[PDB]
Design an enzyme around this catalytic site. Sequence first.
Site, PDB file in Angstrom:
ATOM      1  N   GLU A  63       0.755  -1.258   0.000  1.00  0.00           N
ATOM      2  CA  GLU A  63       0.000   0.000   0.000  1.00  0.00           C
ATOM      3  C   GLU A  63       0.795   1.325   0.000  1.00  0.00           C
ATOM      4  O   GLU A  63       0.292   2.336   0.513  1.00  0.00           O
ATOM      5  CB  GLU A  63      -1.010  -0.013   1.146  1.00  0.00           C
TER       6      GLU A  63
ATOM      7  N   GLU B  65      -5.310  -3.065  -0.665  1.00  0.00           N
ATOM      8  CA  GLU B  65      -4.323  -1.966  -0.669  1.00  0.00           C
ATOM      9  C   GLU B  65      -5.001  -0.605  -0.702  1.00  0.00           C
ATOM     10  O   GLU B  65      -4.532   0.315  -0.031  1.00  0.00           O
ATOM     11  CB  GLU B  65      -3.268  -2.097  -1.782  1.00  0.00           C
TER      12      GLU B  65
HETATM   13 ZN    ZN Z   1      -2.411  -5.112   4.131  1.00  0.00          ZN
END
Ligand code: ZN
EC number: 3.4.11.-
Length: 889
Positions: free
Chosen positions: A268, A302
């Site tokens: 992310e 994400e």
């Molecule tokens: Zn995660």
Amino acid sequence: PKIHYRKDYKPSGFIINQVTLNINIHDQETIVRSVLDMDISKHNVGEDLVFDGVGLKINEISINNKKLVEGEEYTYDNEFLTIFSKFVPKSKFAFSSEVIIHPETNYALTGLYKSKNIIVSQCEATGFRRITFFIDRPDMMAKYDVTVTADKEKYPVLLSNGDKVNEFEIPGGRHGARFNDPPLKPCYLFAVVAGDLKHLSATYITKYTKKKVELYVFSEEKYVSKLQWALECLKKSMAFDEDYFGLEYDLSRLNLVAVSDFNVGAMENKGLNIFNANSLLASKKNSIDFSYARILTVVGHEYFHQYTGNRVTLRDWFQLTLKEGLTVHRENLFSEEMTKTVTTRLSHVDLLRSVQFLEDSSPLSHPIRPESYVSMANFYTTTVYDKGSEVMRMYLTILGEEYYKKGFDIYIKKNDGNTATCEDFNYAMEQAYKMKKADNSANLNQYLLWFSQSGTPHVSFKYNYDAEKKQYSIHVNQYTKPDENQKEKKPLFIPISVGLINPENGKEMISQTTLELTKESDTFVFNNIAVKPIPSLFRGFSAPVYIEDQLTDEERILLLKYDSDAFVRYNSCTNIYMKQILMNYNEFLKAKNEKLESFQLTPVNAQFIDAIKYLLEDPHADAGFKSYIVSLPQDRYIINFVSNLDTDVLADTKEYIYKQIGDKLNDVYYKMFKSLEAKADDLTYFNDESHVDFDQMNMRTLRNTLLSLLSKAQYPNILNEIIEHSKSPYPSNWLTSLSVSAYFDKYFELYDKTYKLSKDDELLLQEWLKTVSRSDRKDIYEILKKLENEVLKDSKNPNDIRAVYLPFTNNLRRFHDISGKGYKLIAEVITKTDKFNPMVATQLCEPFKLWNKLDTKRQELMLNEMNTMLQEPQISNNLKEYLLRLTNK
Ligand SMILES: [Zn+2]
Ligand SMILES: [Mg+2]
Ligand SMILES: [Mg+2]
Ligand SMILES: [Mg+2]
């Protein structure tokens, strides 16, 4: 061997306000120049300035533009840069360094590395220290100004977090780009990408602020046409966070990038999410159906971290479940809403009860918030993720949608732009609990034990019905077995979503009810119950526990046929199978132990087979749900119920049960396989890249499940169906044809055909490798040798290694061959992989997790291999810590 303790958390004596990076990518090395604008914190006690810095080649280090002298003013041991306190300023100062790193030879895929022709970073959890010096911990919040330079022809696309503020040419065919990211962030969210990337793009307009968001999805040129689904998934994720949580994206752009070499699914990084190509790219021609749900969940996951992980940060790594468990919960809510199939929730429960329950009863057992760690990377577990997601989901079950959304908004508003702990989340939920209960005395103090207590609770039942009084009682008991983490286990706050089914008509007898079990035992009484009901317990799998329903198989059949809850129906079928498996297992074991010349096996319940037929023949019933009912529970779920599990005896038990059912239902399975063809394999939308039909994919799952059952049974002329299935345009079908053909002379013919269809797409070849690896072949060891020599070779790609070996470890008869040859083979692969990628070597240890649950001979063989791996002089810290904990050493 350093052990970090949760109770030892203390803020740093330093502050890092600004990071100014210059990353100069060259042919044989990358030069990293970094200026850190620092300060002394209120917690400073005149300590040495210690920076994390792993495998860095120091060219020079300075404080306020004055070059530091090695030995006299600083020491560097390839892990920690120590600047002696007397040389550290007492007010705001600049620390600068110039280091050399080598992404080309970084095969560990952490820090800055090369994946094919793309330079990419991976900083979570401790990868930033592999790029430059830093106080590499998530509470060190800083602003970032990043310049990347590289050869223009090789690397025309340059990306980092924040806004691209400048682009410039450099003499000698080079170019640069400057990115400024003013909002504060921890270093694990930093990312950089350089490559010859191609993209698809779209504009998304937010729900409330009406902000235009630019969305870009990137890959290497060859696979750019496989990005369309990811783009749709990103739009869906944004819409869901807005619709359910009232959360909008705050930045002007969101980039998603696919790379071939990645340790996990995705990452992310703020405005620059990086993905394993297998979790971002798909096409109807070159991907199996599973790719569609996988991309949807990973893109979703994400994206959801933008709030739960990125905007609301972790104070320390012990809080991991706060971002991981909560984000998996957000991902699961999203996927249930997007797929609109009951199998989505069932698949999550199937994952938890097989894989996570095994972990929780193993020597690796830990709470979702552990008390200590040696290797941080070994905290990224199914317990932290999946049990964590179920703990996060229980707040929604307890509070209901309205109050859960109130508590969640409280969490976001109070913690946005700051670090947070598991207590901060519990506090927010408690505020909603007080509001829901209409009393400020109510608390969730007991709920905190879900964060600190390891082990799976066992929940058992007893019932009473008074026909004259029309009064029904449910007596409930909870028990968690003591383990190495707690000698004394305490009762948990367990929400039990319940229904009461009238056995006469299958109707609901009571409204939606969630029993709040807070003691070791309780009795729940219900008045005006006109007839003895069949209880529908733990609807939607309301708590992560072993359920001991104490129902007869007649009662379980009635729930399977008539209950309204998909989980209780699925669970009732699971319990019927488990009672059968345990019985036949004991019968075969006793025969083997006593060396019997003859013996008896208890047949499969005839009314249960009749109920499976009834459900299969119902045209209004769900195809995905039907595929679960004809499949026996996972081997990793079964092992939790058998001591000293003899894998051969379990393989014989499963074979008997499947044959017993097939002997009665094969004609039904065949008729359905043929009748489902038209809808399951419909080509109407094959060339529509964005048209995804989860029901149709479930119809294909059912056909492929039935074909496997029919092929194993050697159903008359089934080989004709198999050969025709190999001609299908859908990889889920043609790869299934390869796997089911294992029982026939045409296996190698389909092996060659499917290899030819797969070889020109990196990801599809990895899917072909998995299909071969899991093929139920007697010559599987010879086949794996052929894959190593002809396809895998010396590949360091984690997707290649995992595809060849992990599916094979699920082969009950062969991987667990009594000679220990399978254990020997996987240990050799672990040791070989550990030389370049310790994280992937630890993932490859997965089959050994159940070592102490098998029969004494296999326990001894597995232990010997783990002790051999432990004795390797060059063993990594990650693999060593993992095997020491697994072998109780
Ligand atoms: Zn995660
Ligand atoms: Mg180095
Ligand atoms: Mg909308
Ligand atoms: Mg490759």
